[PDB]
Amino acid sequence: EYTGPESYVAEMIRERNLDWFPRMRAMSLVSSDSEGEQNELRNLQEKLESTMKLVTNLSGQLSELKDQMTEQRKQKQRIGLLGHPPH
């Protein structure tokens, strides 16, 4: 009928080990937080705006092929209409 931690302590006792005693650490002092996790949120956010790379490149290319075909039509506006008028 050993519980979870109780069985583990039992094997540590049978192992002649004393590493399960707390040393220079208390839960009341660890309960501080110190506005932590902020680094995790910053790191995920930095990748999220780094994810904006693929978000904005699709827009850039979809705009630019249309722009370049329109620019080809504009180039036609000059080159085709140059040879159209007679002499």
C-alpha dist (Å) from residue 27 to 8, 32, 74:
20, 9, 73
Dist CA 86 CA 29 (whole Å) = 93
Q: Is 43 in the site for a copy of itself (CB under 8 A)?
A: yes
Interface pick for a copy of itself out of 17, 63, 72, 75 (rule CB under 8 A)? 63
Interface pick for a copy of itself out of 16, 23, 53, 87 (rule CB under 8 A)? 53
Q: Is 85 in the site for a copy of itself (CB under 8 A)?
A: no
Q: Is 41 in the site for a copy of itself (CB under 8 A)?
A: yes
Q: Is 59 in the site for a copy of itself (CB under 8 A)?
A: yes
**Which residues, including other chains, have CB under 8 Å from residue 45's CB and lie 6 or more apart?**
none
Q: Is 77 in the site for a copy of itself (CB under 8 A)?
A: no
